[PDB]
């Protein structure tokens, strides 16, 4: 049948919702649309990149894009990532189906954090997948 699609939020579009495209893409494969934004680009950190080509995933082609309108209405599900009271969180139109999916941020951290939320987001989506 038609495609789903799935939608990762957080503020700069750079690590947590990057790695879940990634791991979103390889998963839950082309029945679905796998996008990712922020509402702010800060670009794909390279910390990222290097944990996902460990698990021989590559997100080197990835862009960070910013939150498009037409895609948030039309969404199945918007997953945000931002948490709710840190800083700079995406606000939500009414009806558009969504859930928070808390992962720390690994930003400034060493690679260790970005392995451990890289693992944390694969454990997540291979369970909304089997929902
Ligand atoms: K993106």
Known sequence: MDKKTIYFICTGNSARSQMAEGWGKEILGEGWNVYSA???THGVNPK???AMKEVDIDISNHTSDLIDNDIL????????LCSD?????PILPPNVKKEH???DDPAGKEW???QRVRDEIKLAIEKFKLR
């Open 101 to 103: 999916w808390g992962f």
């Open 85 to 89: 009271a840190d800083n700079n969180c």
């Open 48 to 50: 990222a990149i290097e």
């Open 73 to 80: 209405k039309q969404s199945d599900l918007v997953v945000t």
């Open 112 to 114: 260790s954090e970005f």
């Open 38 to 40: 922020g509402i702010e």
